[PDB]
Ligand binder design. Structure first.
Ligand SMILES: [Mg+2]
Ligand SMILES: [Mg+2]
Lengths: 113, 86
């Protein structure tokens, strides 16, 4: 799916230029703020749900993140916790617990949630 | 009826609180099984229907004894756990 991200980001920039030149702005200082105004004026959909309105955005905000390749071309997996089926979770867990242990050997309402 | 009166099943209220002394006597009879016997003996209960009672009671007593023991044995490990979030 990564080839899709390369391609999409390329075409996104080419279409970005294409947008600026017709909309008649400097392609350099063009922002998302300007992207919105632009499409909103070109394809004016009265629609209540705002996700179903036209979008041109950087594919990263469009597409979901992906889980990277989890094993080498030998079949052998990179992370040692892979077989847990959640490596992402238990890595945080291993690290957290490690932090704790080290703290125990060493040691001898701001609106924050 | 041939025995001297007032020696049996008698509490004497202390510091004039009656309700307390009655609770006390009640605890006596119920500790010895006399209340369950009065209540048992209001009507009859036939011999078979009695061994059934006996056996159900005694099974149930065995179960509750064992389960009690097991609970009070595992009691220690109720203590807040050391290894959390390993
Ligand atoms: Mg008489
Ligand atoms: Mg009995």
């Amino acid at each position: 799916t990564v080839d899709f991200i390369k391609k999409q980001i390329e075409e996104f920039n080419i279409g970005k230029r294409h947008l600026a030149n017709m909309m008649g702005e400097d392609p350099e200082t063009f922002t998302q703020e300007d992207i919105d105004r632009a499409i909103a004026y070109l394809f004016p959909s009265g629609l209540f749900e705002k996700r179903a309105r036209p979008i041109m955005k950087h594919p990263e905000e469009i597409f979901p993140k992906q889980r990277a390749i989890q094993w080498g071309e030998d079949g052998r997996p990179f992370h040692f916790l892979f077989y847990t089926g959640k490596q992402s979770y238990y890595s945080l867990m291993h690290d957290t617990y490690g932090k704790l242990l080290d703290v125990e050997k060493h040691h001898n309402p701001i609106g924050s949630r | 009826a041939n025995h001297l009166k007032f020696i049996a099943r008698t509490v004497m209220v202390q510091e004039g609180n009656v309700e307390g002394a009655y609770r006390t006597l009640n605890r006596i009879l119920t500790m010895d099984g006399l209340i369950e016997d009065i209540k048992r003996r209001r009507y009859y209960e036939k011999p078979c229907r009695r061994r059934q009672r006996e056996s159900y009671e005694t099974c149930r007593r065995i179960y509750n004894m064992e389960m009690a023991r097991k609970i009070n044995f595992l009691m220690r490990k109720n203590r807040a756990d050391p290894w959390q979030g390993c």
